[PDB]
Structure 1
Amino acid sequence: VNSFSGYLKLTDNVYIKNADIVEEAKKVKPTVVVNAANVYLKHGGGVAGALNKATNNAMQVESDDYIATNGPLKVGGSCVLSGHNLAKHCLHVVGPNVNKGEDIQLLKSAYENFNQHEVLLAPLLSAGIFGADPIHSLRVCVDTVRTNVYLAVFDKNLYDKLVSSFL
C-alpha cells in the first residue's frame, strides 16, 4: 500500500491520473519523481522547467555541478539526483526529443531506467515538447516498465484520449 490517490489502473503495475506532476510530488513526496530531462540537464521548459522552478532553482544548481563533473547524459540514459523539496530522489531520464531528430526507438531504453526503482511518480517520456506521440509513449511504458509507475498527465484532453484509446 502506498499514498498515491485517484489513479486509474491500466495494468498490474501502471497507473494514470490527470495531474500536475509538480503538485502531485509536493503532496505525495514519493521516493522517486522522474524528470523529463535533456542530456545537458538544462531544465528550461516542460516538466523539467516546472520541477526546477518548484525547487527554487536548486535542481538546476545541483545539475550544473553534475554535468561539470560527469559530462552529458546519453539519450535513453538517466542519473539519480536529489528530489529537493519534491521527493527523496529525482531520476532524470532522457527520452528522445523528436523536435531534435532523435531516434524514437530510444524511448524503450529510456523507460528501462524505471526498472531500477520499485515505485515512481513519472510523466510520459518524450511527450509534450519532446514531440512524440503520447499514445505511443504510454504503450512503450506499459510494455517496458515492470516496477510500479504512477503516471501524471498534465493535459486533460490528452488524459481522456489516453484512457479511451488504451488497449
Structure 2
Amino acid sequence: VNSFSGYLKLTDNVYIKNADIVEEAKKVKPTVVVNAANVYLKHGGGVAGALNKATNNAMQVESDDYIATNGPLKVGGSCVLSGHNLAKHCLHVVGPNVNKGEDIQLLKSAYENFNQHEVLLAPLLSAGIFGADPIHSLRVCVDTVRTNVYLAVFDKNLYDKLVSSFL
C-alpha cells in the first residue's frame, strides 16, 4: 500500500486521479515525479512551469547546469534530476510536441522511460500545451508502461472524458 489516495484503477498497473500533479507531489512526496519536459529543460509553462514554480525556480537552476554540461535531451528521452521539495527525484521526460510537427510515434519511446522506475507520479505526456490528443496519450501509457504509474490530470472535464472513454 502506498500513500496515493483517491485514485481510480484503470489497469493492473495504471491509476488516475483528478488533481494538480504539483499538489499531489507535495502531499505524497513520491520517489519519482515525472515532468513534461522539453529538450532544453526550459520549464516555462504547462506542467513544467507549474512544477518549477513550486520549487521556487530551483528546478530551473539545476536544469540549466545539466544542459550546460550535457547538452539537450532527445525527443523521447529523459534524465533524472532532483525532486527538490516535491519528490525524491524528478524524471524529466520529453514527449513529442505536435504543434512543432514532432513524430507522435516518439510518444511510445517517451513512456518507455517510465519502465526504469517501479512507481511514478506522472502527467499525460505530449498532451496539454504539447498539442497531442490526451485520450491517445493515456492509451499509449497503458500499452507501454509496465511499472506502477499514478496519473494526475488537473482538468476535471478532461479527466471525466478520459475515464468515460476508457474500456
Cα deviation for residue 154 of structure 1 reads 1.1
Whole-angstrom CA distance in 1 between matches of 2:20 and 2:3? 16
For structure 1, list consecutive stretches of 5 or more residues without a partner in the other structure.
Answer: none
Matched pairs, number: 167
SS at match of 1:16: strand
TM-superposition CA deviations, 1:105-157 (whole Å, max 9, x none): 00000000000000000000001000000000000000000000000001100
Shift of 1:63: 0.1
Looking at structure 2, the residues matched to 100 and 90 of structure 1 have their Cα atoms a distance apart, in angstroms, of 25
Task: Summarize deviations over 1:37-74 as a string: whole Å, max 9, x none.
Answer: 00000000000000000000000000000000000000
Q: Which residue of 2 aligns with 1:94?
A: 94
**Distance in 1 of aligned mates of 2:28 and 2:93:** 20
Give the TM-score normalised by the residue count of structure 2.
1.00
CA distance in structure 2 between the aligned counterparts of 1:90 and 1:100, rounded to whole angstroms: 25
Structure 1 distance, partners of 2:104, 2:19, is 25
Give the distance between the partners of 2:97 and 2:158, measured in 1 at CA. 19
1:67-125 CA distance string (max 9 Å, x none): 00000000000000000000000000000000111000000000000000000000000
Which runs of 4 or more aligned residues in structure 1 lie more than 6 Å from their structure 2 counterparts after TM superposition?
Answer: none
Aligned to 2:10: 10
Match runs of 1:2-151 below 5 Å? 2-151=2-151
Report the CA distance between 1:164 and its aligned residue. 0.3
Query: What RMSD, in angstroms, separates the aligned Cα atoms of the two structures?
Result: 0.3
C-alpha separation in 1, matches of 2:23 and 2:141:
22
Looking at structure 1, the residues matched to 100 and 51 of structure 2 have their Cα atoms a distance apart, in angstroms, of: 22
Normalised to the residue count of structure 1, the TM-score between the two structures is 1.00
- Structure 1 residue matching 2:42: 3-state secondary structure: coil
- Report deviation, 1:19: 0.2
5+ unaligned residues in a row in structure 2: which ranges? Answer: none
Determine the C-alpha separation between the residues in 2 that align with 1:140 and 1:22: 23
